[PDB]
Design a protein around this ligand. Structure first.
Ligand SMILES: Nc1ncnc2c1ncn2[C@@H]1O[C@H](COP(=O)(O)OP(=O)(O)OP(=O)(O)O)[C@@H](O)[C@H]1O
Ligand SMILES: [Mg+2]
Length: 223
């Protein structure tokens, strides 16, 4: 047991409608949990709760450990690509190199004369959205953390790159890590240990891929 939610309900608006209603799950160390559902279902809000940014109105959240969060929206601080990835933490050569490879940043870095020492301005608006997204993922995965919260880290990448990085980073590099991945792709759900499908704040499904089927679930993963 590393993350537990029991009977969790929450409101952003003090007197409005619940953003999450009666959420239940448990994640054990090293497991991959897929959190799926359409726009507005409550996926990011669920992560906010784990991070203590959204307090429950009822129920219990039990988690132990340092969180590393990859936001749905990429961000870039003033500094080099290297400094953005390392982000405070001490530099470990092997760790750094493996993350850069897993997030396909080798080819990008090589194209600048200053390499990963190129200086970016706040927002990194001279880079592409894909480049910023892969740096933001690299930043999250480089961190020594107990719980990795990855909020749609491939939403600004093409389908092939998404497949490749899901494999190289989430599946291979992070194989021993406790991961919560916001994603609705069938391939990703198939590889997850557990799946939570949210629909309009509620738990539409919680369980394994084999349970999911044996019916119309896939319609609830879209939009
Ligand atoms: N950090 C935040 N602070 C305040 N309100 C938020 C925050 N994140 C989400 N909300 C609000 O909570 C509600 C639930 O939406 P949420 O962002 O959790 O859905 P989601 O499943 O992440 O959607 P998407 O797939 O579009 O990213 C929305 O009304 C949203 O405006
Ligand atoms: Mg979201």
């Amino acid at each position: 047991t590393e993350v537990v939610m029991e009977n969790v309900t929450a409101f952003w608006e003090e007197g409005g409608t619940p953003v999450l209603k009666d959420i239940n799950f448990k994640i054990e160390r090293g497991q991959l949990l897929a959190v799926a559902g359409s726009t507005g279902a409550g996926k990011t809000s669920l992560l906010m709760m784990i991070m203590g940014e959204l307090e429950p109105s009822e129920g219990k959240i039990k988690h132990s450990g340092r969180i590393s969060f990859c936001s749905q929206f990429s961000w870039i601080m003033p500094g080099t690509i290297k400094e953005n990835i390392i982000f405070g933490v001490s530099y470990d050569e092997y760790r750094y190199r493996s993350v850069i490879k897993a997030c396909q940043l080798e080819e990008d870095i090589s194209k600048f004369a200053e390499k990963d020492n190129i200086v970016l301005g706040e927002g990194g608006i001279t880079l592409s959205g894909g480049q910023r997204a892969r740096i933001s993922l690299a930043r999250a995965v480089y961190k020594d953390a107990d719980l990795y919260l990855l909020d749609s880290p491939f939403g600004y990448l093409d389908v092939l790159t998404e497949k490749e990085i899901f494999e190289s980073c989430v599946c291979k590099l992070m194989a021993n890590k406790t991961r919560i991945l916001v994603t609705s792709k069938m391939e990703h759900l198939k590889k997850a240990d557990k799946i939570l499908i949210l629909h309009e704040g509620s738990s539409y499904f919680y369980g394994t891929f084999s349970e999911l089927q044996n019916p119309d679930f896939s319609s609830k993963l879209m939009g």
